[PDB]
Amino acid sequence: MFLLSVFFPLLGGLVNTSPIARFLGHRGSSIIAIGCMVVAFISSVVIYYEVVFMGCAVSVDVFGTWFSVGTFHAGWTFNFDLLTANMLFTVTGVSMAVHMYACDYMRQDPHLNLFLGYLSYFTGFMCVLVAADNLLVMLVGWEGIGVCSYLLIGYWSHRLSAVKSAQKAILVNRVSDGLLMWGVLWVWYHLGSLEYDLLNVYSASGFVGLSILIGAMGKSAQILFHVWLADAMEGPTPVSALIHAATLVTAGVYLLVRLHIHDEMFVIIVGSLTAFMAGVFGATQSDLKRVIAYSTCSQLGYMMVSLGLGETGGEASMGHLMTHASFKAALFLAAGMVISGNGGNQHIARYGGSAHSAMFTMLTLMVASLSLIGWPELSGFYSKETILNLAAICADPIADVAHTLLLLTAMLTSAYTTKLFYQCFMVDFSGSSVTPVRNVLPILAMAILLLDIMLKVWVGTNLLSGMLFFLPWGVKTLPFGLMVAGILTATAAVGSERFTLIRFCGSRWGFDQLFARSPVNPIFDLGRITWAIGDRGLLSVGNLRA
Amino acid sequence: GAGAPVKLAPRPDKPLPTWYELWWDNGYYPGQPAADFMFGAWPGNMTETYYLRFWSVFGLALAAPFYYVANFTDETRMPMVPQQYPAEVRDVLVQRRNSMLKHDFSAPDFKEVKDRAKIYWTPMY
Amino acid sequence: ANAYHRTYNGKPVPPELQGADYITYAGVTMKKEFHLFDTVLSKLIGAGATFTCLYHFYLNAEEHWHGDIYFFEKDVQQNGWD
Amino acid sequence: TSLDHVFGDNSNKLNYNFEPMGMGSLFIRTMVMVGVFFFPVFIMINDDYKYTSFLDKVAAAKAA
Amino acid sequence: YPGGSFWSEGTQTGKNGFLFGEVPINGQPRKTLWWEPYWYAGFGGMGVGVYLIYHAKPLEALDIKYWAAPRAAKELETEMRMLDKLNERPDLKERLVAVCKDLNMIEDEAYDLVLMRNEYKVKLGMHTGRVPEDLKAIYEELEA
Amino acid sequence: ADRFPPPPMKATQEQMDAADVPYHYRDYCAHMYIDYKECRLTSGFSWRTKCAHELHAYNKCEYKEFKRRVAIAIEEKRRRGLIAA
Amino acid sequence: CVRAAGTARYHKCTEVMKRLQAAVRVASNVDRGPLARKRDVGFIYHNNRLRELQQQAAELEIENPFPAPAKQATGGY
Amino acid sequence: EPSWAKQLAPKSGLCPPEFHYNREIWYPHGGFYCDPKGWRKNTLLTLGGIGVLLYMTFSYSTANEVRHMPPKGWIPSIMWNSNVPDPVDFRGRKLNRDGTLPEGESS
Amino acid sequence: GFGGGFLDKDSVTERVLHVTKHFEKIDASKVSPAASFEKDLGLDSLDVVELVMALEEEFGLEIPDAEADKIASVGDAINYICSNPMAK
Amino acid sequence: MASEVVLALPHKLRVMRMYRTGLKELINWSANRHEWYPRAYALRQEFEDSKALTDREEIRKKLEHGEELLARFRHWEPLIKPEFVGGTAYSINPAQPKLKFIPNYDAMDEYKKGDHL
Amino acid sequence: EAKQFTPDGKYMPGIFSKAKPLDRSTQWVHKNPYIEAWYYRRDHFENEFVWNYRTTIEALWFLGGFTAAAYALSVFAFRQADRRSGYPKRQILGDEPAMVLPDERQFY
Amino acid sequence: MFISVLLILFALCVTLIPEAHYHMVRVWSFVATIIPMWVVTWMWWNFDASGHGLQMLVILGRSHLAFGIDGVALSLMLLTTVLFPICMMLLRTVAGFMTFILLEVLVLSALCVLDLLGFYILFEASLILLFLLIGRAPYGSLEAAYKIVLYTMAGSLVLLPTLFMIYSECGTTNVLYMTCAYNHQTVLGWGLLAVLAVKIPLMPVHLWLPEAHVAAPTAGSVLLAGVLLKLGGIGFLRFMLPVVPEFCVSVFPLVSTLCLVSFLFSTLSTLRQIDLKKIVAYSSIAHMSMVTLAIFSQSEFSAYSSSFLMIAHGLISPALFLIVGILYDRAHTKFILYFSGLGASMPIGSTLFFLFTLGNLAFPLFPNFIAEVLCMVSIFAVHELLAYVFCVCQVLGAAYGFWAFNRVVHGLPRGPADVTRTEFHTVLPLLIGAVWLGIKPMA
Numbered sequence A: 001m002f003l004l005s006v007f008f009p010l011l012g013g014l015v016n017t018s019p020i021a022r023f024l025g026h027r028g029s030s031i032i033a034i035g036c037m038v039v040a041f042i043s044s045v046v047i048y049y050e051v052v053f054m055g056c057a058v059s060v061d062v063f064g065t066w067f068s069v070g071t072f073h074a075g076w077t078f079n080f081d082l083l084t085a086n087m088l089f090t091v092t093g094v095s096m097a098v099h100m101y102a103c104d105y106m107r108q109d110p111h112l113n114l115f116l117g118y119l120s121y122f123t124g125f126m127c128v129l130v131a132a133d134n135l136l137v138m139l140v141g142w143e144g145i146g147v148c149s150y151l152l153i154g155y156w157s158h159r160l161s162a163v164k165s166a167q168k169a170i171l172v173n174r175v176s177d178g179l180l181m182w183g184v185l186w187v188w189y190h191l192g193s194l195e196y197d198l199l200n201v202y203s204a205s206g207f208v209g210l211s212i213l214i215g216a217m218g219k220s221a222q223i224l225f226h227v228w229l230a231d232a233m234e235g236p237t238p239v240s241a242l243i244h245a246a247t248l249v250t251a252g253v254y255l256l257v258r259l260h261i262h263d264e265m266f267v268i269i270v271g272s273l274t275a276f277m278a279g280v281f282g283a284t285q286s287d288l289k290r291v292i293a294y295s296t297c298s299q300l301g302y303m304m305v306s307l308g309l310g311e312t313g314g315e316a317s318m319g320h321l322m323t324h325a326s327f328k329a330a331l332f333l334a335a336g337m338v339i340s341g342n343g344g345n346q347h348i349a350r351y352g353g354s355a356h357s358a359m360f361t362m363l364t365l366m367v368a369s370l371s372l373i374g375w376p377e378l379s380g381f382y383s384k385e386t387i388l389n390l391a392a393i394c395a396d397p398i399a400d401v402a403h404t405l406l407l408l409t410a411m412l413t414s415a416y417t418t419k420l421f422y423q424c425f426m427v428d429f430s431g432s433s434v435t436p437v438r439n440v441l442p443i444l445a446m447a448i449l450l451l452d453i454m455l456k457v458w459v460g461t462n463l464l465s466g467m468l469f470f471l472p473w474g475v476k477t478l479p480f481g482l483m484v485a486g487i488l489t490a491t492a493a494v495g496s497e498r499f500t501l502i503r504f505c506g507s508r509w510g511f512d513q514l515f516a517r518s519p520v521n522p523i524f525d526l527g528r529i530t531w532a533i534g535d536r537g538l539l540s541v542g543n544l545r546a
Numbered sequence B: 001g002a003g004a005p006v007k008l009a010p011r012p013d014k015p016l017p018t019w020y021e022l023w024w025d026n027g028y029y030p031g032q033p034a035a036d037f038m039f040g041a042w043p044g045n046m047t048e049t050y051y052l053r054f055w056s057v058f059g060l061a062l063a064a065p066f067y068y069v070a071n072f073t074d075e076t077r078m079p080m081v082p083q084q085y086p087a088e089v090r091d092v093l094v095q096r097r098n099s100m101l102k103h104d105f106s107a108p109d110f111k112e113v114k115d116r117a118k119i120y121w122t123p124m125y
Numbered sequence C: 001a002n003a004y005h006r007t008y009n010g011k012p013v014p015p016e017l018q019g020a021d022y023i024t025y026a027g028v029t030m031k032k033e034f035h036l037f038d039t040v041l042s043k044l045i046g047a048g049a050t051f052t053c054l055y056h057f058y059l060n061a062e063e064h065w066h067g068d069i070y071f072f073e074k075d076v077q078q079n080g081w082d
Numbered sequence D: 001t002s003l004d005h006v007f008g009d010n011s012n013k014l015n016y017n018f019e020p021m022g023m024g025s026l027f028i029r030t031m032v033m034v035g036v037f038f039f040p041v042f043i044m045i046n047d048d049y050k051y052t053s054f055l056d057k058v059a060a061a062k063a064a
Numbered sequence E: 001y002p003g004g005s006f007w008s009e010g011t012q013t014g015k016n017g018f019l020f021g022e023v024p025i026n027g028q029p030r031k032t033l034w035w036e037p038y039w040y041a042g043f044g045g046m047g048v049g050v051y052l053i054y055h056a057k058p059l060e061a062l063d064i065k066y067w068a069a070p071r072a073a074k075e076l077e078t079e080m081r082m083l084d085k086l087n088e089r090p091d092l093k094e095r096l097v098a099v100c101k102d103l104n105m106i107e108d109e110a111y112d113l114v115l116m117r118n119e120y121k122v123k124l125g126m127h128t129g130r131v132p133e134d135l136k137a138i139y140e141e142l143e144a
Numbered sequence F: 001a002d003r004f005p006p007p008p009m010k011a012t013q014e015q016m017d018a019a020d021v022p023y024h025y026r027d028y029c030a031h032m033y034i035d036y037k038e039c040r041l042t043s044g045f046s047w048r049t050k051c052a053h054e055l056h057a058y059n060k061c062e063y064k065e066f067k068r069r070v071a072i073a074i075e076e077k078r079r080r081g082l083i084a085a
Numbered sequence G: 001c002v003r004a005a006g007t008a009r010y011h012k013c014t015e016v017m018k019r020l021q022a023a024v025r026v027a028s029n030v031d032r033g034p035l036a037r038k039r040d041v042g043f044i045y046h047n048n049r050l051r052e053l054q055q056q057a058a059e060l061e062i063e064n065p066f067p068a069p070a071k072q073a074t075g076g077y
Numbered sequence H: 001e002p003s004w005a006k007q008l009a010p011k012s013g014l015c016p017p018e019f020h021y022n023r024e025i026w027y028p029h030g031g032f033y034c035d036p037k038g039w040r041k042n043t044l045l046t047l048g049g050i051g052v053l054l055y056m057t058f059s060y061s062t063a064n065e066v067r068h069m070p071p072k073g074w075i076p077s078i079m080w081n082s083n084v085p086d087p088v089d090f091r092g093r094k095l096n097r098d099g100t101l102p103e104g105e106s107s
Numbered sequence I: 001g002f003g004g005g006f007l008d009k010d011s012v013t014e015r016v017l018h019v020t021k022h023f024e025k026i027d028a029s030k031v032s033p034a035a036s037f038e039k040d041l042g043l044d045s046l047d048v049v050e051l052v053m054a055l056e057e058e059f060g061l062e063i064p065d066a067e068a069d070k071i072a073s074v075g076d077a078i079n080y081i082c083s084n085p086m087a088k
Numbered sequence J: 001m002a003s004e005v006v007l008a009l010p011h012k013l014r015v016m017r018m019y020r021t022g023l024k025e026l027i028n029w030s031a032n033r034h035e036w037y038p039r040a041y042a043l044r045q046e047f048e049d050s051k052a053l054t055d056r057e058e059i060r061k062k063l064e065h066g067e068e069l070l071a072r073f074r075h076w077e078p079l080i081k082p083e084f085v086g087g088t089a090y091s092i093n094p095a096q097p098k099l100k101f102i103p104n105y106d107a108m109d110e111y112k113k114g115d116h117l
Numbered sequence K: 001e002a003k004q005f006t007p008d009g010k011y012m013p014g015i016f017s018k019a020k021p022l023d024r025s026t027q028w029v030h031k032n033p034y035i036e037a038w039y040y041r042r043d044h045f046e047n048e049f050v051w052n053y054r055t056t057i058e059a060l061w062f063l064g065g066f067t068a069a070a071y072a073l074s075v076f077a078f079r080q081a082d083r084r085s086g087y088p089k090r091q092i093l094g095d096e097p098a099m100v101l102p103d104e105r106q107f108y
Numbered sequence L: 001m002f003i004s005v006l007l008i009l010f011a012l013c014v015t016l017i018p019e020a021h022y023h024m025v026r027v028w029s030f031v032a033t034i035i036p037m038w039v040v041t042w043m044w045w046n047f048d049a050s051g052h053g054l055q056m057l058v059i060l061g062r063s064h065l066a067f068g069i070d071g072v073a074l075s076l077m078l079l080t081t082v083l084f085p086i087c088m089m090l091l092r093t094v095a096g097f098m099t100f101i102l103l104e105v106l107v108l109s110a111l112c113v114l115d116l117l118g119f120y121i122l123f124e125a126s127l128i129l130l131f132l133l134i135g136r137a138p139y140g141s142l143e144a145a146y147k148i149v150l151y152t153m154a155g156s157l158v159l160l161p162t163l164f165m166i167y168s169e170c171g172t173t174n175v176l177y178m179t180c181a182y183n184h185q186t187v188l189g190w191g192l193l194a195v196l197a198v199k200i201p202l203m204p205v206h207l208w209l210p211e212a213h214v215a216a217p218t219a220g221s222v223l224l225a226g227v228l229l230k231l232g233g234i235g236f237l238r239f240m241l242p243v244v245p246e247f248c249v250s251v252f253p254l255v256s257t258l259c260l261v262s263f264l265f266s267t268l269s270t271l272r273q274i275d276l277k278k279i280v281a282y283s284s285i286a287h288m289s290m291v292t293l294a295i296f297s298q299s300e301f302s303a304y305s306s307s308f309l310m311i312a313h314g315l316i317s318p319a320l321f322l323i324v325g326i327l328y329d330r331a332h333t334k335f336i337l338y339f340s341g342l343g344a345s346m347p348i349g350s351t352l353f354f355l356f357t358l359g360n361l362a363f364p365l366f367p368n369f370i371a372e373v374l375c376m377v378s379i380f381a382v383h384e385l386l387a388y389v390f391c392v393c394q395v396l397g398a399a400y401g402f403w404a405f406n407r408v409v410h411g412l413p414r415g416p417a418d419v420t421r422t423e424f425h426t427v428l429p430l431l432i433g434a435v436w437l438g439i440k441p442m443a
């Protein structure tokens, strides 16, 4: 039951991409993918139950070593702890519904089976990454999910914008991966082994934490690395949902939680800055997908702050990930359903009424919005309040800035989420498309997401939920009031006169433009200078005419 | 609804630039440069000078509270000491440099504990 | 096709497209339709979420109306310390 | 040309001169990139400088 | 959906694309190319030899790493008790500390000296006098 | 800390090992943590009901500990002179 | 040892960790070659230099510009 | 029309009739809207292979499982694995293979 | 269906006529196929621009600026639509 | 200010494109079409206050000021229909252009498919 | 439409076939003269070098400057590695006679 | 030796074949290269890793010509003997068969040489062969052959006085006695550095390769890419470190800085390339510089890591050349702007292009990834700054790689259809070898 959690999606994806798929068709490919996802999900549920509740960690010898030269020893070995069990359970539960939705959304796509196979590869490599006991397998999972994301974003190879976005994201993640590789070099040189269980550190040389955090921020799309995330909406809805729910974006935070070898000051500063930037970004746009992506970034920043707080903060951050994934995927899927009912319209300004879409999709979007904004007694409510309370008691004076920033960010989160729902349904109709699709499978996927959200409340992620921390009565009620304020302001749907601030905010602070010409055009010029001026010039040896 | 008709990119008919290897022509109109914003217009017609001018104040406005709180207020601001643990238990927990228990100003070796907590970068021989 | 048909030019609305199954406004007709499985599943999920929130709140209402400080100091003063 | 009346003709011409960047701006941004993306070099070198300053002060005081 | 159901009859018979561009002609079986048998024979023979090398050559013959595991296991076993006794004899530990100070070593290199009793520089310095004579005694009583 | 010394530990190292307690929770309320963990990690869905007393006891012990920490901070400030005495 | 101990690893598998780090150091630094700098997995040279610098600065009657030496940096040393 | 076209299958009913896709390309996955005739029998055979590989990896997983510590309570892994050590509770009392308190302290 | 991505002449004509009559100055009986905007219907340049935008909304089209400038009569717009494979 | 091509437009056409693009931008800054209606009425009225202008200098002044206002207000995220230029659904999956096929190339001219030297 | 084969294989060259025979050159592109001129110029860009102001400035500040930077960095890394292994000053190329290759038989 | 002479005479029988029976000509030409592959397999089965660091020793009297086998030479021989049959599969003339047979003989003889004079003599005996290969009348460039031949001759002429001086100094030319005598390490060291910095592409004297490897046909391109650069690395490992260590030490900063600047400038220069073949040409420079730095590091396991990287490049890069050659031959041009929509046109070929692109970019499940990990382990142990410099610019190579791949593969379909059975077979050995060495290279 243990190795079923990893090998089964991989085998399913291999079959879906094998020449065997020629003899099956899209019907058969969908059947195979759904069956593989369900079986892996059952295995993951069993493993989660046993590990979390009965505390049984199991280590696996899989393929022997991978390579052992010198004191460096690398082995195909898998270990399942509480962290690995949580990650596997979350990823499988997300990706099962993601596959269910993708089996219906792209029904009129020509090459559906390739899409299914790449999704299965993405899920399997995520399972590989989380199953890692040593850092090399973590790297393998990192690059495998990167490759799968590259293929999935560039699925529609006929649109240049998607190709540009994929290449940009790949290069940014490769910068992060070089930083991570340098950190791995340092970790092995100063610790002599790669298994996380053999990594217990009290005070490193600083570069360890710095480089590891930079590499993690690369995957988590934090400050100075978030630009790629918005452009990823060029890909199909299932890819964005899977990436933003439980994979890729989660991997950096997962590595940080597994390691717990960071530096609190830099972690807190980066997380707070990224959260504030994501919050101000999400309320200032009109593309539906970009807002949800920026919300993903904001929750990533929340988790960063939590893990920077401490070990308890790290576990709370892991629980925040576990609760965030479900409703993030739910929001993505509901947005995709509404968009398809809107004739592919991906802009908010042409929506309205209760005629374009089904009742279940509307209710699912409502529930996901309520959970994400921290509505009292809900899934995101518990994790967000726990992180806030643990951040309202930190011993770092730096954290005081972070607490205020996160309060503002949560208020803005409620603001733009309520604006999203308001523009989706509450406003009058202002588009031209009504094709309400009421197919069983995506509705069932939404149902599974909502059931998992219910479980996350009826059953806590860890023992932290319910652990009461002693705050003044106003302090606890503060995020509730902030969400109420966001509700009021968004239901007013009002705006300001300071239009220069508006044009600045909408531009995403010009970060893409800044990176367009500070490093990039100079890289191009350095390349031309090197080649032409040196090789054909200074390094050139001409001909002796005669 | 695949199969929408798409305009093609007609082949060039005049001498190419020396550095033409920055325009991305995928065969369909419209093409794009190697990267967005690299040359030509920007959405909103803003310029780099505009954003540099704005950031010249926005960055310091964001950074100012960090420096003020890190340079004018200490652990005495919190009305409680960190979570207490027995000596044989605390003695390992505080060994971590990232560990927050170092900020107990009531610690018997408080200044010494903070002394060990500084961060180095080059390993010393 | 489109769930909304547009008539234009004040054309006589098709007789086949009239009845309880068709509701017209500004010359444009929309259909009154009901889906059984969709509505039933929506009701089930909504009821589940509502009951979840209600019961979780009722189990933890005192820890919200008064503060944890207030509630636990009240318990200590009134119901002992050990 | 059969789709120009639907998605635009080739009348409009791109306003790009294909020219190398400004020398001073290129130099300044190259230095900015080098500083941002080679910080460990400076950190190690400054560590060595602080270490040798400590040794110099020790040598100055220890021989008197 | 064809037939109005997801469980309807198929629609495709014939050849779906041409692999390699090889097209059947008059039902005649495809001609084998001139190079195919020799290529297959040579490359399959190399692969078979590779598998037989990796799965039939003696472990010592295949790689050195197998030759040293049984020989190092016993040395580790007999040095573990030496280390443990060094945890029980402060006099021997401080003698080894003095030896390490004599040998450009720091206080923390105590266990390093224990594990290197079979090293080239150690024995050569023992023979030439660079190593203190007392190191031999330390090894002798720790083995005891 | 002398004015408000910690109470004796009712949980031994062996008991915490048997309960598999995370080491950063080995506080002056360890036994309450252990009992809460043992109760909740066995109840299934209805953990908030059949383990309410355990949670309340653990939170009460933590309330005592938090009061002790606040009092220690106040006494330290008074000694150093940060608060009028 | 690590997987048998579980949570109690911070007071139960110290000595075996020290043994393993010592073995790694012996494997690396002995016959290290002509160009490779010396390696301390347990940061032993770092903290010993730290203690010597602390003592020297104490004799120097000036404020320490370096972190105070640590008792141990890893789960082993 | 070329000779080899007669060996080629037509465009599938799933495919949009207004689309042309150069049907002659051999694709690794099947191509465009691929939907063979005997597809359900192929699907059943594929599921059979899936189940066989599932059984093989199930056997290997049960074979190579290493449990370094007793679990905290009853688990379903017992019913198919005997290498699983007998559980030990939070209080350290050893428990039977059914995960219940033994006699003397039970009931 | 009908048309290689194109709709019928007749529904296009009917939709264009139905859009056309949305002006206070306009008498209904004078709107007909291939009708002059300025000379016949007496609509200013602002009215022509508004009609272009309204037809763009009705047929879901993003007309290029030059083609829009070419539009000056009912028949021209109808024939332009009769050239569009992108009109709904 | 407009672009050089727009600078070449006739006065009537220049003002027409100005008004059209202004309506486009007002949609782009609009929360909804319903919000856009009164803005559309006001924008139509404002031009109505300039209908009877004759002095070309003041006409050019008004036109230039309006062009500068519009240029300052280029929307960063325009509202586009999905299947047009710049839209998200544009250039997703086109029909395959005709590509010739070469049957049994290896079968032709065997033993002589290498490289000249 | 040609017949480059017989009903039983036997590739026919079809020298005297009216139809155009499918061959290796079948899918060759039609070259664009401007593209050909551009590619010749870029493959023969060597004739465009000149000691102008810009070229010299760029060559000194970047090429030689970063050569010097990497050289000094290598020297620093080498000396620091020497100091981190307990070795005295070592003789680099042109550094006066000094210690080279620390003996394996000496503890440093 | 006897077996080797039998193969030498058996290979020469190609010319004696009358040209009338083309079928047998191809069969004989292919089988002549097939045999040494099995012979090297038999050698590997015969080797003992528990034996001496050198095995299968043989000396031809006082005629120098000392032949012995280490792991590096055996692995290089295996990789070359895998490569050569694919090159034979891409030729159509007897002259090409003879030239490549002589080239393979020379490479094999040099790969296990143990005499420095012997290496000098045997290595550059193929320079005229390369000259005739590259500058072929209908499609080659005479300038590229002129360049490469002059560079190689300059290196050899610089080295020769050092070789004869150390010969006179120690009275012989065998490595195992050259390594044991006191010598003026400096002069011989300069000679060795010059030759093996010309052979391996190192800045500044590296400019022959971009023209040469592009002007040559597919078979010669693969040969030059996967073999002659590794003659430099095995040259270092077999000669320079065992003979003159002090020069190696005192030059280490120079070698390191030269390798670093070579890697940086080559990586930056590649993005401005406008032809796929030139892009592939610049790609190998970074790999060779990394190999050289790994060799010169000598930290923990430098020789093994360098050998792993050499094998990885000699495996992956020839696949890039195979794809380039297929595209050019079935397209008649190498210019990028004529490549588009290749995935829909060449599905399996484009998939292989993707896979081998990732192979060039050091991704997991590939031997290049482990190779660069080991090389960076060796570099890091010496110092962390060099390792960071290698680590930081990893993005810059993948930049041009992905840009070129996406530009030529995605977009408007235009160009050739997918690959043929022969082309897939030529691709096959590299894919299987890369998978095998990226999953379980060792056991």
Ligand SMILES: CCCCCCCCCCCC(=O)SCCNC(=O)CCNC(=O)[C@H](O)C(C)(C)COP(=O)(O)O
Residues within 6 Å of the ligand: I043, I044, I045, I046, J011, J012, J015, J022, J025, J046, J047, J050, J051, J052, J053, J054, J059, J062, J063, J066, J067, J069, J070, J073
């Ligand atoms: C966000 C908003 C930004 C600002 C947007 C711009 C707002 C400023 C608008 C105010 C300035 C003007 O109206 S611009 C001034 C426009 N009016 C004139 O120039 C005088 C009339 N001249 C003529 O040639 C024709 O009557 C003409 C009416 C042009 C054509 O109508 P027809 O062809 O039917 O005949």
